[PDB]
Symmetry: T
Subunit: 145 residues, 12 copies
């Protein structure tokens, strides 16, 4: 029933809890409405999902195949560096995806430069905050037609 | 209750799900039945377990110790490359194990050559498809009475 | 309510499932009680948590922020080597922590020398058995007061 | 200061030159007009520059300092992997920039995973073809406003 | 003629020749007889070859092409880690092969983790003693019949 | 002398010779008196030693064997990363030891992550300031029974 | 019918220095003449080009596509170890090429063992002096007709 | 006798067996006869040798010294990557050599980039098929005079 | 007189910009005049050259050999880390050189610790700002007078 | 007020001990008098020190903080590659320093390219002989007013 | 026999060619006779073996086990760096061995620092010429009584 | 003629403090006396030296050149892996040396495989216990006629 699925990895539920300094008030829910609205404007159905449990995300990707999800926008967050299971899930279902990160990963610790997903994504957007999700959706829409 | 436990890692539930010749026709369920039948022929009880959640598999291994499981045949799939927790579960319960992979892991990406389990398995079978599980079971049967 | 939080990672529930054979007779429960008792003597509230599921530990760390936990004492066990999600959880909630390991890690396989948490901990204690947790608490108490 | 400069690196002049696809038709000139048009529709002035000569590009970013330039969108192409001179040019003029690549750089040779620019960029977009420039521009436009 | 060829690398002639405990009582000749019988039972002809000389094995593999050998079961032993000539022999004659090791190669020195053959084999069996050959043969029989 | 020896490596004499934040109040002598007191309180004799000279420390470790020292608590400071001679002294005399560092070694330069002692210590404490010495001693007292 | 283009990289203009033997008498122009003559002898047109500027060479390679050049013989010299831009130029215009070096590159510093071209050349000739260009031309002629 | 010796390594005897598709119709014997003829035309004697046995090639190189061979043209094939014995043979007899490979070794697996012979060869030719031998011979002729 | 050439690499034309607090009081032009004056004061002619184009600097080094330049003082800037071409230009013309960097190159990012020039320089000066050029010149004067 | 301390590391006392052939004839004492003189002419007091014992040098650096030494010129010699204790001494006293080496360290063995001091020095002078000390003194003088 | 076997690897048969410079005057036969004589003086039986063929050496080591050889003195020459087969032969027959090299292996190319035998030898002697063999023999004689 | 100097490194004074075997009995003295006796039987004067202090050993090596020592036999023990200062001492005095180790250094930890002396020694003996020193002395006597 849903054309595009947005997946948020672990810790992203913490957006907007931190402070008036570190981030402002933008929360995961705010991003989700903005993303739903944008899809609705383009007559596309859009579902979202967040968990801190790798298996929950894997399950959800499997469920997306049965639901005929055409494209996934995923921010795997920390799991990009660690989860080959997440990689094999996306590959196994054969749903193309776009990888999104809020922050510039290449600007932090060296271990963050490695991704188990990037080489198999259509593309990647790093360091543009929430707008990254939006840019990925815009591309996805362009490609769904 | 069960002398031998067969563990399937993440994504193995997808076997046979893209039926017309992507992965072919064989399912996880099919593999399980073949193995249960083989064990029954040799008067050995055999349980199986599959999950996409690392913690579920870890829990299962612990339960296996309390059940007196004698040997584990495990296809950790992606987790072989990533999970020291899975390694420490198997070592902590001290149940010998045989590592099985359907595909030839050495023929794919370089990150798939590294295993957190292989050096502690009795042995390993890769690349022989489902027959790998059957060979492991055959071996396990002869090791036991 | 609960004031200092102690987190035990995967497989630590196996402590004392045995004679003198991986360890002696000390259990996770025994360690916990000693810790609760030590904190009670200093008029500090202390909660504990263990799980074999990475996501359950991540969720618990998030809950800790809401409940105003001032300091976490964490034995991530295997997860120290593998989980950047755990790192990002501790960092995202901005609760300082002390890393504790029962055994000496540096005396085992090379892959156990790498930690995704050590560099962000206040400090680390390895190889001193359960007393490591007590020392961490002692330090945590003096840091609070 | 409310002008934007788009820099194309070496070999991007070859876009569209080999008749049909894979990745035919679309040319550098087409991309430039699209971008100019997009900047005109938001009342922003946009220049473009392509060269196969590192020094020409370095000169051009020194010029950009002396003129209005508030943000650079750069596709360095091959120079991403090789030119610290390009890095020190962007850092020396202190003009923020967004790195863009048409293709998924992580999906090709290992030497393409290294970038002398990425860690200093605001952000990076790879693998989304020409839309990547457009997305970088959209972001840039709501960074002046 | 030949149909399935079993190749034993250097030092495998020593099997069962430091008779007390280490190794076992089992000899290379015993393994060969067992395999010849197993093949006879399935109406397949099976030849065997051992040498401590790399060139002899290479020559043998060439001969196998001219004899119309359908599948090779090879235990290259030490040569796995060192011989690209061997690799290029197997590839040059284009006869599929299964790699077999008696012992768990991944449990020993790090230099044993590397193979110049594994990535081109159908599959690999390590650490199951002589039964590994037998399993390889069982797989081979089914592939032909 | 005798029973427990505390060794301080190079540059630890500078403690509390800077008053402000780039050290603080606490001197090396203060630490020494605290430990002596703590040992006296448990009826254990405790000697201490500092030097900036690798040989002096080595000579003292040899002397410690003659004196029947039961356990060493050592903060090798910079020598942890460089001195195999120190490692061989401790191993040669066969006196178990506990490694202590004031600061969190893992939070600093990558060359401080390597230790020529850690793997042979009973255990290691880093990042807990002077209290690290006290915890090591507490452990040392309980173990000498 | 056919142009062959010979490209000389940076510093090859210096051929003919401390003339009676530091290197020999032979100059770049001499090499060109022999090559031009050789080609005329086989009714093939042959242009040549040298520069010390990466961009000039790159521009030349683009011009070659528009000129219908069939094969390039390139001595990139120092640029073989540094220029992915040069690689992408040759690949982008899709003109097969032969890589030539006067001196034996493997016999010098380790950084000269790496090439950004070699893996995409038809073949490579190193260490045979100027005869290497002639051999490459001889091969290019046969290959064209 | 101005003798030149052409050495063919392991698996080169297979040339012209897998006839129509993967590689062509040309044989080792063909290559040899063209080379003998090319040498006769220039009044130089030329012997040839192929083996799959490292020791046979080593013996042959020693004989070459006693026969007064002036120059060796060697295609070590797989042995280039593995045989320091072959290197030391060439060095020990002090006969200059040219290294020849039919295929472009740099275009295949990363392990093929390493050579135990290249750094000591006069030069190297890869990827030009059998003409590589002819070019080496032509160079050898001019060198000997 | 006895001509000395001072080469400034890419980005050094960025001279001084926003002077207070971006360690940039003095221009490239100010350094040049100072050096010209120092050379005039010792009766030595001194030319200077800056460019952002590698090929312009290489060309200038070739012209310097024909002009009988005795010694080069070069601040390659970024080029130090990337240009073997530059290295080969300096070695090909055989003009001894002194490498100078304004900033302490070893104090910045790890890729700045590698130089394609240092090992062939007479010596190197880093970190001493503009004085470093003046010290190189002084040394160059004593070497010729 | 402003003492400047020159420290010479191990083996530098051998300067002038196999005098010919115009390579190594100036002594350490010559260098010292030459520096003392240069300092007296600028009304700055200058002490010097040489040892072959790491601890002696570390003691001197500590004494230098007590004495109000404003800047250290150090030629650690072999110790630059090995001594983190030296690094920590200079950092612990917070006396800025300039690293000097007589020979060009980058032109010798690869292990000489690593320094435990360089990244924390103001700057470094390699390869200019004894004149490197003088240039460091000249810079040091101008820095103290 | 009460035997000591002496094994010489590939290229050691060349000892003796070019008396003045590359090679002194000692031959393999001289060495042998000098060792036989030494063994006879001590009433010990000594055999010797040289080959350029790995397999021949391996066969000889297997033969030595049947003959009751007590200790092997092996100069594996080039095979020390390449042959795990040789390693597994010596281990498989469980005859202790002493490794000998004529030249200082550590003074030559980096690849000569690696040995597949050294870690399993009783000891190793390098760089002492032929006397190395004599010293190994002297040790071997004292060991057998 | 004159003197041979035997240098013992750190911890070698501990020899003989634990029977029957952790290598008990034999003392450094015992060794020293043996070597003195052996040199007196060949009319050679032999001095010996041991320290745990790197600087004491360095000083002794300088005060060895002055006394016309002709050859040094050094067991640097741990310092072989760490001391470039020890290297530059032996090289600065230009006294040839032989490196000796009691134990097989290649059988122990990987960090013991690296030496800062080996490559400059005449040769090396490891793993032959105290007889290694004798063998070195025997060699030294024949060399120093």
């Amino acid at each position: 029933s849903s054309t595009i699925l947005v997946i948020h990895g672990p810790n992203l539920n913490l957006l907007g809890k931190r402070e008036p300094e570190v981030y402002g008030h933008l929360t995961l829910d705010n991003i989700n409405r903005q993303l739903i609205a944008q899809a609705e404007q383009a007559s596309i159905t859009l579902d979202t999902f967040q968990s801190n449990w790798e298996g929950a995300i894997v399950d959800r990707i499997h469920q997306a195949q049965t639901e005929g999800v055409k494209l996934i926008i995923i921010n795997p967050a920390a799991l990009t560096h660690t989860s080959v299971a997440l990689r094999d899930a996306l590959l196994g279902v054969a749903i193309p995806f776009i990888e999104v990160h809020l922050s510039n990963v290449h600007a932090r610790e060296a271990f963050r430069h490695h991704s188990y997903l990037s080489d198999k994504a259509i593309g990647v957007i790093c360091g543009l905050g929430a707008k990254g999700y939006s840019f990925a959706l815009d591309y996805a829409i362009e490609k769904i037609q």
